[PDB]
Amino acid sequence: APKNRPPNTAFRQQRMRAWQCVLTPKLIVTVFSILAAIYLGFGAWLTYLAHTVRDLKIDYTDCLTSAPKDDFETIPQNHITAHFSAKDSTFDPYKAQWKTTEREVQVANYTDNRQFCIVRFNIPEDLQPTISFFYYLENFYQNHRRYVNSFNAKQLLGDAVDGKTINDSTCDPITHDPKGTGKIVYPCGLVANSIFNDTFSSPLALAVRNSSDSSRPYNMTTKGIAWPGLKDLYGKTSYSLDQIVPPPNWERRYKYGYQENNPPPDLKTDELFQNWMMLAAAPNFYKLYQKNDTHPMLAGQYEIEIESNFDVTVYKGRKAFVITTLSTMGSRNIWPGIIFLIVGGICLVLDIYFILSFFIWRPRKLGDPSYLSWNQ
Amino acid sequence: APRKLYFNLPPELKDEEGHPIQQFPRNKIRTAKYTPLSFIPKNLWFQFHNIANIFFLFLVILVIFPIFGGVNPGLNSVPLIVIITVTAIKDAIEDYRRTILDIELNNAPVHRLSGKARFHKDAWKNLVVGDFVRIYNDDELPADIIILATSDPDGACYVETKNLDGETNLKVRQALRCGRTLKHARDCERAQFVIESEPPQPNLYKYNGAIRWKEPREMSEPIGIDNLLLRGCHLRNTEWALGVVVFTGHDTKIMMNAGITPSKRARIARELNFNVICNFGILLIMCLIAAIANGIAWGKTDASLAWFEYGSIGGTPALTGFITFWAAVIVFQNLVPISLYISLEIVRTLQAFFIYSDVGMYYEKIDQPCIPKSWNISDDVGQIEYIFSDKTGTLTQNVMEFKKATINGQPYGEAYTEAQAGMDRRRGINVEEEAKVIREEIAAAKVRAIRGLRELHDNPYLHDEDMTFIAPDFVEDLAGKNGPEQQQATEHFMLALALCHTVVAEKQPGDPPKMIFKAQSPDEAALVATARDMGFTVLGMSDGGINVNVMGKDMHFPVLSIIEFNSSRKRMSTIVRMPDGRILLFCKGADSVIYSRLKKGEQADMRRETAQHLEMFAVEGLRTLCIAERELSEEEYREWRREHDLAATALENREEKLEEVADKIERDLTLLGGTAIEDRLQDGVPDTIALLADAGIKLWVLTGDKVETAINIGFSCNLLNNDMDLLRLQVNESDASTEDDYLQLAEEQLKTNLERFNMTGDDEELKRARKDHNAPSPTYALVIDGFTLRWVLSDSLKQKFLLLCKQCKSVLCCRVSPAQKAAVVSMVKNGLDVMTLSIGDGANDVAMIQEADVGVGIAGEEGRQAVMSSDFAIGQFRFLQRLVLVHGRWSYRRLAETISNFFYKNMIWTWSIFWYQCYCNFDIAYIFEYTYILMFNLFFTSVPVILMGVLDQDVSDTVSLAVPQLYRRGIERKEWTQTKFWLYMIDGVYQSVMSFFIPFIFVVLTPTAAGNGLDVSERTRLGAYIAHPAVITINGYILINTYRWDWLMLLSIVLSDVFIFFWTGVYTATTYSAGFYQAAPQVYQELTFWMCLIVTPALCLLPRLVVKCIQKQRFPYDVDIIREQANRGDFAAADAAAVA
Ligand SMILES: *[C@@H]1O[C@H](CO)[C@@H](O[C@@H]2O[C@H](CO)[C@@H](O[C@@H]3O[C@H](CO)[C@@H](O)[C@H](O[C@H]4O[C@H](CO)[C@@H](O)[C@H](O)[C@@H]4O)[C@@H]3O)[C@H](O)[C@H]2NC(C)=O)[C@H](O)[C@H]1NC(C)=O
Ligand SMILES: *[C@@H]1O[C@H](CO)[C@@H](O[C@@H]2O[C@H](CO)[C@@H](O[C@@H]3O[C@H](CO)[C@@H](O)[C@H](O)[C@@H]3O)[C@H](O)[C@H]2NC(C)=O)[C@H](O)[C@H]1NC(C)=O
Ligand SMILES: *[C@@H]1O[C@H](CO)[C@@H](O[C@@H]2O[C@H](CO)[C@@H](O)[C@H](O)[C@H]2NC(C)=O)[C@H](O)[C@H]1NC(C)=O
Ligand SMILES: *[C@@H]1O[C@H](CO)[C@@H](O)[C@H](O)[C@H]1NC(C)=O
Ligand SMILES: *[C@@H]1O[C@H](CO)[C@@H](O)[C@H](O)[C@H]1NC(C)=O
Ligand code: BEF
Ligand SMILES: [Mg+2]
């Protein structure tokens, strides 16, 4: 009896069930037809979507640079980017006045003096809820190799890790006390150091002469502004408030240190900190600041008070704010629609050319022993 | 190193610690590539022949410096150690299979003795030089042994040399004169004598030595080959041959023509090595771009990096650019892919497995499939031409039948050949049914001839289906029909075929006793075996001469004398006194040797008809023989015998005097008839050769056998033909010719032959012959023996010789030496830029096999001296078509497509990373969450491409045998060019551009595209956004490029994509990651995610889909059209016929 007989399976003998993917022009015409159909459909859909949302972006670096001090001068047109369908209403965007003012404010004890800008921007139509409010930072690179690994995780989680492990961690230059003493910084990275410092004071809707009272504060919240998982990442600190200090740049805010009146901010609630410490990808990123889910902003000449605390033209950067309204797709991005339409259009024109060159023009009947290249 | 041997006191001139000089190798034989004690360094140096491993080892020792990105212990050092270890494990397992069959051979038993006082059974390895040895019938010989005695007196043993030299006949060997008398097994311990020998020489038929047999004082008996039993020779017609082992180990001429299984490499590895170097070049170029741009951007006091990041990785922009350079070299490591070599090892091993488990190449009589022995080279078999072939072992089974005869001008063949069947069915005539009806006529004639024989005297020794000379006309002519004189003619002829022989007859009792015929060559064995199947069966020489049982009645012949066969005589004779009183001399031999010894001026029509019939028979591939007779006289016989025994008594120059006296009696003769014996080919060998020659392969039969048998086999196999000029390059080793005249004669022959081919070997008509792949002029053959071959392979004639051998359609070397086999293979292999297969069955064949690119052994049961050193081990020649035509073009196309798609894959990955670096001031920041990069090339994408390489097939297992011309595309090496590589890399770069800049656009050119509105523009969420569509794109491109979408391939594609989704969704549900804490619920549930997931794979696979469909329609392939044909039908006949 023969024992070395190789098993006559249908896999060992390479006989598995299969489909010989011959590209006869009854198979590729249908492929290109279905691709063109699906992609032109999705392109029309996404174009309608990216046209159903509407927004307004205003840049405000010349506030500290060149805004006037007592009169509401107009903003040049290279700052207003307003996508609003219902054009030529009683209000029209691209006409916003703006004025800066050095103001003596209080924080905990010492009443420091910051510098403010005030922007009167008019939206011409209502925008239904979930009106978000992002800030925009050009030429800011959060995506560097040393920058993106520079923080302690357990510390943000809420912990008193050590004075040694924090001292030699990947957050090298900013992990110990800048002054003489040997305290340890609470957020020990330079990713938490450079957090955006401007402060947006919610749109005070000027009197539209319907409710003629001067103030109509469209109260937008800054809570529930990040993913709940982030809240599961952070936590109030276990440090004794004795050995922690703002790293170098919260000084103009914690001008005396972490104390019983200026306490170390709990991170599970500080949601703007949670938005910042998730590192953006490009240098021209947006980030979420406020929102409102339960009431529609009406057409009106709103006014926002932007404490311009972040000196950004120092590195030729730019900063701005946007008030986009959302849809199921996202915010206004005209490019998905155009990309889908372009792919569908080229698939359609190649379908047309293939059906032509394989049905109407010469069809090159299948398998003839004339092209075999050993019959010539 | 000329050695000496002593048998019972050593020579005091080699004292203690001075006697071990003349260190003789151990009788073991190592064909394994690695020893246990030295496997590691050898295998490491072999794996590092791949240049990329140098780059990977340098990059591993470079991450130890704790300044760049990835820490050293696991991430970057586990892959190298694991890859090296699994590669070494595969190679060690393969080498151990070779080693286990090696150690199976090394334990073969031999009766050893010089210390044992008896010839106890031992193994081959236990054979020290100078130890007595006994050998029995058909025993493979352990080592080169000098004879000392044998079973029969006079010292005659027979050696079947077919394993070393392709000669079939049992060559006679003589025991040395003094010392033959040691019949016992223990009377050797008083045999005191000394042996003198010479250094080991690889020339087979040149050896000399001496013996000192110590009242005897001093003896001396030179020992040529006639005392030398070689190692592959099989001892026959002798019960015991009490020899002495003189050579052992690698001193033997059988082993002295090989290395130690020189490790072959797959010829795709080298072009792949150049491609690796080019990819490393582009890697360095892009890393230098990165370093310069990073330094330029980091040496500014105006960028936002100076303010917010207090930093520099060195107190200079130049130093930080340098650090970034090396760190980028770490990040862009996959330009020279690490996963290339392990993927290719895994693919090649699986293809070797699939070769091993194919029943379509399972030979039953030996019970083993096409077991591969080098799993690296499975793709080279898709490129080879120049299938060099042995003759005696591979092509011919070496069973010799008796087909036809021509007696009294009358032919009796009634035979048909598969050779002729193919030769006719190739043209329009006799296509299919004629074969069946003709074989039916042959069966009918066979049964009618057996019936006619039964009507004659009862023949118990005759056995149906034990006879090949079927001729009913012969039976009726011997019965008496058609003539009373023709009966006498055929009767006397069949009596002559039972008189001229020397065969020994033995009766096998039981069922009607079939008699066995032990002869000196299977030629006369077939002669006599047919001379009993038509009456006139033979018995033993019962103290007189032969006894013939003619038509049921016995006849005792006294044999007067016999003149034995020789290589120079070409004929053999015997004088016998027949019962009719008169004595008669028979002389049978070659056709052209008897036509010279014939009484002239007689039987003009008879002799011319016999000449034309032998011409027909020798053209049909049969090995003809002529028999002649002469009525000798009593006084003439006794006087010739007195001259004969007088010449025998003259001890000096005796053989020449015997040949001179024996040529005075064989001059006047007359032609009884002419036989036609056929040396049987294997099954399907003519069809195999036809199929291969249609593919594009050129087949050079180069045997070690005589010059005319080679031409016979060239006629059988249909290599030769009847419309073919013959080029016989010969420099007759004219006695004592000046050597330079040898070369001058050879040069003139080469020059006139090249002339007539209308050219010469001017070295300009070689660079135009390094780029030509065309079946040559089909009307030329080149027959050249070893001597002419030896002299045309020396300095410059070689080149000329090459050109000659390139024009002639066929080549038939003859009496060629193992070293010369290897030299011809190496001349065609190096002188041209071409691949080369060598199929063999023996020692000469092992030399030919290790020197060729692909070595195939045949398991011809002759001792696997050429199977333990081959790439593959086939059982028959007919499976070579299956192997080369199915598992060759398949494997080659598969490896080409695998490595092309693989370069594409790694290109798209690393160039997407590079574009991201472009968007972050070239400071090398991963966008892929430090685990996508870890698991990408491992899990998400490796299985689709390895499956495309292992289990993809273009046409079929049978449509490839039905259309061999497709193999031409592998001959000219058109599936792995250097434009498929560059086109695939350009494709990868384009697809990286698209598959990075589409999701980047989607989720970065807008404020937080996330539907409910939250941060998904993060550095890692964008990583998922471009890393899921990238995996789907790569697997689609690996799928679009395959031809046979089957169960496993589509299953693996689906599981790889579903596995990236599952791995994300599972790994981002815990706090352990903290960058991906919940990435699944807030990336999946978006709509831009699915929009990009469906748009980037199409936008990446659309250009090659368009190119593929158009380049199928407007321009075809050959495989394209054969698949468009075999799709509908046109090959269902072969499929249905083969499956059942
Ligand atoms: C909001 O954030 C921005 C950016 O983080 C922040 O602007 C920063 O203020 C810090 C100081 O609080 C600046 O750092 C200084 O830079 C100057 C110039 O290089 C240095 O001379 C300063 O060193 C002196 O002062 C230190 C502090 O007393 C001493 O320790 C030191 O010995 C020196 O005497 C100091 O390093 C930083 O440059 C700016 N950033 C930019 C971009 O200009 C802003 O103040 C923040 N506002 C609030 C309210 O948090
Ligand atoms: C983390 O690394 C820093 C840098 O090496 C370590 O530095 C220094 O730590 C000592 C020990 O507390 C500090 O000294 C205290 O300094 C005051 C001077 O104001 C001195 O009067 C006290 O007697 C005491 O020595 C020192 O100021 C501090 N210097 C700096 C620049 O940080 C630090 O100790 C490391 N952390 C730990 C936990 O070890
Ligand atoms: C969105 O803004 C509107 C602005 O009116 C908020 O409505 C006011 O909410 C406050 C409490 O936060 C009430 O005291 C006022 O009486 C409300 N005014 C009106 C006219 O309704 C609304 O609460 C905000 N909602 C969200 C989700 O932020
Ligand atoms: C605020 O409190 C801190 C400590 O409690 C004190 O040192 C500081 O002087 C206070 N502010 C003012 C303006 O005095
Ligand atoms: C918005 O509502 C909060 C909660 O009552 C309140 O503290 C805040 O002053 C309001 N905003 C304005 C501009 O009044
Ligand atoms: F012994 Be062979 F036919 F080279
Ligand atoms: Mg052989």
Residue numbers in the entry:
A (entry chain B): 23 to 398
B (entry chain A): 83 to 90, 93 to 197, 321 to 421, 431 to 1356
What did the authors write?
Most P4-ATPases form heterodimers with a β-subunit from the CDC50 family. Dnf1p and Cdc50p from a thermophilic fungus, Chaetomium thermophilum (C. thermophilum) were cloned for structural studies (ctDnf1p-Cdc50p). The purified ctDnf1p-Cdc50p heterodimer showed phospholipid-dependent ATPase activity.
In the E2P structure, BeF3− is bound at the phosphorylation site D606, same as in the typical E2P structures of P-type ATPases. In the E2P structure, the amphipathic helix of TM1 lies on the surface of the lipid membranes, extending to the brink of the nanodisc. In the E2P structure, a phospholipid molecule is found in a cavity formed by TMs 2, 4, and 6 in the exoplasmic half of the M domain (E2-site1). A PC molecule is modeled in the density, though it could be other kinds of phospholipids as the resolution is insufficient to distinguish the head groups. The head group is surrounded by residues Q549 and N550 of TM4 and N1153 of TM6. Therefore, the E2-site1 is likely for early recognition of the phospholipid substrates that have been picked up by the flippase, but are still located in the exoplasmic leaflet. A second lipid molecule is identified at the cytoplasmic end of the groove formed by TMs 2, 4, and 6 (E2-site2). The phosphate head group is at the water-membrane interface, clamped by R181 of TM2, F569 and Y572 of TM4, which are not conserved among P4-ATPase though.
